[PDB]
Design a protein around this ligand. Structure first.
Ligand SMILES: Nc1ncnc2c1ncn2[C@@H]1O[C@H](COP(=O)(O)OP(=O)(O)OP(=O)(O)O)[C@@H](O)[C@H]1O
Lengths: 96, 103, 403, 204, 113, 108
């Protein structure tokens, strides 16, 4: 009897408040900020999906995720995304 | 409408009557809340600092108690895992013997 | 802020002692200690206290939550200082709990006794309600404490007790103990305290016990025997009793499940509706044979009366911050029943909220926990009654200092 | 041959896409915020043993005026209050930081006649007002709206009737509540609608 | 426990996009007016009555000396000592590696908005 | 048991790795997801979110506004050379366009 619908608003304001302490974000702009996240999530996951299936694989992996980020994001966009993720996977498997 | 509404409306007129009666009896609402409060608040105050600091320290105490109970429980679980690994040791020896048969 | 200092919570049924800033007390032991007039000799650790003894007194120094036997009280504090804390009292400041209705003479006598006999560096005497409020993280709230001797509702507003709002009722753990006595007698149960049994064998449900009595037992006195039997009764209270989730209904209580139980000698049986009827007397004393009278207030009514005696401006805070304590509140469905009745009888203009503590340590030793947190703040280190306050102002300083 | 030697996931991602000598000590310390010189003990490092306490700033005493005997006698005099009756109020004010829900409860009703909260508040406030009035001329803001006790005695009261209303006024009032809409709709949806229809039928 | 800054990851300069040329001027100008600014850390009225005072005759506006013959000297701006170096991005000057570090962490690119 | 640590926290992300991996676990994007895919995907997702929020806020400040409107998004994603590419076939609601007036359609 509630009908709760999920969204990314809580983490786009953490990241925004951190990367712009004085700047807010309107509700309508956060809707765009949410749709953007869902769109890129769809794109990267779909490309990793196809990547795994091309090599006759039943599992989408972070290696396939990195290659899909190499395919999706343009040159710099890619480099930064790949570096950020790569460094986030060595900070996570080191039990920090 | 209908002329019969005379009755319905008359009942509503009675609702007015009771309304009036009840408004004479006790009233519908606590009207005119805090019209006049001239007392100035303290700067912040020693007692308020005590309340604030205990507000923090009670949450800190609760977090510490919760955390240490959880820590104790997961040490129990970790030692349980270590003991069943100290039986998987015997299983690993038996499996190595089976591997020796296969070799 | 936190200094080597001792927190004492002296309840009518048990005493808790420990250091500042601990999650739990260092020791807890029965307040109803044992004594023989040998000066007199005392026993407090339950291992020496449960010995059947050539003579016995079971003296119980406190009357209605207040000190009356200062000699046995001094003996208790001595034994606590050198059996569990094991430290020189002149080193550590002392924070100690008291009943909200304790008189000024008792406060002053305790102050001078603490400074003369125990040579302590500093002192702070605080009321169980405020300590319980601090333990539960609030500066304002209605503190309900259902202890052994009396069930009491005490409003704390901005850290201070409202004397005009205190409401007290004898419906408490001792009254439950009396109800258990009566129920056992009406069930013709052979209650035997644990010290008497040498050995025993199993018996069927409802059949008398099959046990051997120890041969070395001396002629123990009535008071200590009563104490031991009451201990078994309070174990039964933990084991069997349960409050009806709503008003007691004989038909519903007949439909409710039984609980199986065994007494120390081996007698064992199922308890049914009766185990729900006994605690009902805490919430509606009208249906309590032998205790007829409309002057008695039950737990929920104690609460509503206590809040109703305060200013209407602070009633919203009190109802929005009902803090519940005392061992009797550990009875199954006690808090649910209390919440239900208070939801029924709290005026709609105000929010009702009960703080959600549930652990034995929480419910019972909230006062000690309050001492533990309170003794661990810098803003509190200036509130001490120092030995200098006593040497200059005398025994009366405790009246001029903290309420 | 594959160098690897590191975590599987990180390795694949990276290659597949090429003396303390600071002794704490148990230490005596005096709190400069205290006037009794009481020495307490504390757990401080070695490098700060001797610094002043950092919790003495949390000591902002609530301000309360202190009338003198002569001053009280001249202006603070009140036929319904005696000096023994008035000094007690200010002592409780200070010891309870000028809060009047806790000053009341501890009032000495044995030597002292019973007072409500409002009368105590008004009394202390007239005392503060006249204390500042003794000054007045030194820009002592003679614009103080000292707590209204009359209207406020009422305002306390006419909440109490609404506090304890078992049903009806808490329950049955819903009806009158709805009536607030009805009484505010159907009358104009009556006498006004009639007048409009009379004009409409007049032109018709 | 953790290094406890990867959560906020403020700068993450894979896309840094330096600020330069006219932006430097803006910063310079800002600093100048800040040094010319007032208590808060009527000026509009001053500017208005100054724009009433515009003319070619000897007046407030025409009483400005101008550029100096003796050329501008370098100073460090972190400790104020003579500064052999310039910051490649914003053009502000400094005298050590340490000073460049502090400048990069607090004053380089961060206050150009 | 042990105090539970999330997956956004251990890695050091703001975007929900639990929720991301979750959409993946019951998203049929694959058949058996590993233990790095959601982390990488969330990291890059939120990286692009930050990348854009940056340009959007900067343009907003250029407009002397403290709240990012969709305009501060059209202007941005079209102002940056690679964001435009990535979001080339994406229309931002209530964003507008950039005032690119052809040179030949000007006063002469
Ligand atoms: N686990 C339990 N379940 C139910 N009732 C219990 C339980 N433990 C104790 N009691 C009841 O609580 C009573 C003791 O309560 P408690 O220990 O809180 O009192 P106290 O601290 O001595 O009280 P006070 O501070 O008011 O003097 C016992 O007599 C028994 O009736």
């Amino acid at each position: 009897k509630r009908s709760r619908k999920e969204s990314y608003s809580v983490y786009v304001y953490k990241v925004l408040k951190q990367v712009h302490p004085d700047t807010g974000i309107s509700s309508k702009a956060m809707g765009i900020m949410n749709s953007f996240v869902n769109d890129i999530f769809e794109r990267i996951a779909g490309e990793a999906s196809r990547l795994a299936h091309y090599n006759k694989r039943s599992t989408i992996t972070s290696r396939e995720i990195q290659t899909a980020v190499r395919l999706l994001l343009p040159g710099e966009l890619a480099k930064h995304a790949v570096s950020e993720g790569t460094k986030a996977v060595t900070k996570y498997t080191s039990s920090k | 409408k209908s002329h019969a509404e005379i009755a319905e409306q008359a009942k509503h007129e009675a609702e007015i009557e009771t309304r009036i009666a009840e408004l004479r009896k006790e009233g519908f609402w606590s009207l005119k809340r805090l019209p006049k409060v001239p007392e100035p608040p303290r700067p912040k105050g020693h007692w308020d600092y005590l309340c604030e600091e205990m507000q923090w320290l009670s949450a800190d105490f609760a977090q510490e108690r919760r955390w240490k109970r959880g820590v104790a429980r997961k040490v129990v679980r970790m030692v349980i895992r270590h003991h069943e690994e100290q039986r998987q040791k015997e299983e690993r020896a038996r499996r190595e013997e089976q591997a020796k048969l296969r070799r | 802020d936190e200094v080597g200092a001792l927190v004492f919570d002296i309840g009518s049924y048990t005493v808790r002692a420990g250091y500042a800033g601990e999650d739990c007390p260092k020791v807890d032991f029965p307040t109803a200690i044992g004594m023989v007039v040998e000066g007199p000799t005392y026993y407090i650790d339950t291992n020496a206290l449960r010995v059947p003894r050539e003579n016995m007194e079971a003296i119980s120094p406190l009357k209605n939550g207040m000190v009356e036997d200062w000699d046995s009280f001094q003996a208790i504090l001595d034994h606590t200082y050198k059996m569990h804390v094991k430290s020189e009292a002149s080193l550590h400041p002392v924070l100690m709990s008291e009943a909200p209705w304790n008189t000024r003479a008792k406060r002053e006598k305790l102050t001078e006794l603490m400074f003369e006999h125990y040579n302590i560096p500093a002192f702070f005497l605080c009321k169980t309600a405020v300590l319980t409020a601090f333990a539960n993280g609030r500066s304002t709230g209605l503190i309900l404490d259902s202890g052994a001797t009396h069930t009491t509702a005490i409003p704390v507003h901005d850290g201070y007790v409202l004397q005009q709002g205190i409401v007290k009722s004898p419906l408490a753990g001792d009254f439950i103990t009396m109800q258990c006595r009566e129920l056992f007698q009406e069930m013709n149960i052979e209650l035997v305290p644990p010290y008497m049994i040498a050995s025993k064998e199993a018996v069927r449900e409802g059949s008398p016990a099959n046990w051997k009595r120890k041969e070395k037992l001396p002629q123990v006195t009535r008071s200590w025997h009563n104490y031991m039997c009451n201990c078994v009764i309070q174990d039964f209270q933990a084991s069997v009793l349960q409050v009806s989730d709503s008003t007691y209904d004989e038909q519903v209580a007949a439909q409710m499940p039984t609980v199986h139980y065994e007494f120390p000698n081996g007698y064992n049986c199922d308890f049914g509706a009766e185990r729900l009827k006994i605690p009902e007397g805490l919430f509606d004393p009208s249906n309590v044979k032998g205790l007829s009278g409309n002057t008695m207030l039950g737990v929920s009514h104690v609460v509503t009366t206590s809040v109703g005696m305060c200013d209407i401006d602070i009633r919203p805070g009190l109802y929005g911050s009902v803090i519940v304590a005392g061992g009797n509140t550990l009875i199954q469905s006690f808090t649910d029943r209390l919440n239900r009745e208070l939801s029924q009888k709290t005026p709609p203009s105000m929010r009702l909220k009960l703080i959600a503590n549930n652990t034995t340590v929480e419910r019972r030793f909230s006062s000690w926990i309050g001492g533990s947190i309170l003794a661990s703040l810098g803003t509190f280190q200036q509130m001490w009654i120092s030995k200098q306050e006593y040497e200059e102002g005398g025994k009366q300083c405790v009246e001029r200092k903290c309420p | 041959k594959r160098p690897e030697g590191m975590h599987r996931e990180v390795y694949a991602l990276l290659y597949s896409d090429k003396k303390k000598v600071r002794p704490w000590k148990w230490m005596p310390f005096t709190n400069p915020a205290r006037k009794d010189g009481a020495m307490f003990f504390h757990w401080r490092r070695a490098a700060e043993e001797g610094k002043d306490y950092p919790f003495a700033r949390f000591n902002k005493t609530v301000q309360v005026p202190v009338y003198s005997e002569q001053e009280y006698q001249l202006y603070l005099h009140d036929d319904a209050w005696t000096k023994a009756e008035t000094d007690h109020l200010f002592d409780l004010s200070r010891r309870f930081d000028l809060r009047f829900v806790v000053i009341h409860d501890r009032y000495d009703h044995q030597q002292f006649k019973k007072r409500s909260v409002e009368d105590l508040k008004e009394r202390y406030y007239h005392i503060c007002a006249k204390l500042a009035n003794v000054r007045a001329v030194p820009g002592t803001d003679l614009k103080i709206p000292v707590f209204d006790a009359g209207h406020e005695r009422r305002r306390k009261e006419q909440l109490e009737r609404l506090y304890n209303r078992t049903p009806e006024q808490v329950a049955e009032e819903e009806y009158l509540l709805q009536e607030l809409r009805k009484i505010e709709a159907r009358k104009k949806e009556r006498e006004k609608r009639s007048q409009d229809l009379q004009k409409l039928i007049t032109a018709a | 426990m953790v290094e406890k800054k990867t959560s906020v990851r403020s700068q993450d300069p894979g896309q840094r996009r330096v600020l330069d040329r006219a932006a430097r001027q803006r910063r310079i100008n800002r600093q100048l007016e800040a040094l010319e600014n007032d208590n808060f850390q009527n000026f509009q009225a001053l500017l208005e009555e100054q724009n009433l005072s515009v003319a070619e005759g000897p007046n407030y506006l025409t009483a400005c000396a101008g550029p100096p013959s003796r050329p501008q000297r370098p100073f460090c701006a972190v400790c104020g000592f003579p500064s052999p170096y310039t910051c490649v991005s914003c053009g502000a000057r400094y005298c050590t590696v340490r000073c460049l570090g502090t400048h990069q962490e607090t004053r380089c690119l961060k206050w150009t908005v | 048991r042990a105090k539970a640590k999330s997956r956004s926290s251990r890695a050091g992300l703001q975007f929900p790795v639990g929720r991301v991996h979750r959409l993946l676990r019951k998203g049929n994007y694959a058949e058996r997801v590993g233990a790095g895919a959601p982390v990488y995907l969330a990291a890059v997702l939120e990286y692009l979110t930050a990348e854009i929020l940056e340009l959007a806020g900067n343009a907003a400040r250029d407009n002397k506004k403290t709240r990012i409107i969709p305009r501060h998004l059209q202007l941005a994603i079209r102002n940056d050379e690679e964001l435009n590419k990535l979001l080339g076939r994406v229309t931002i609601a209530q964003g507008g366009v950039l005032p690119n007036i052809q040179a030949v359609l000007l006063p002469k």
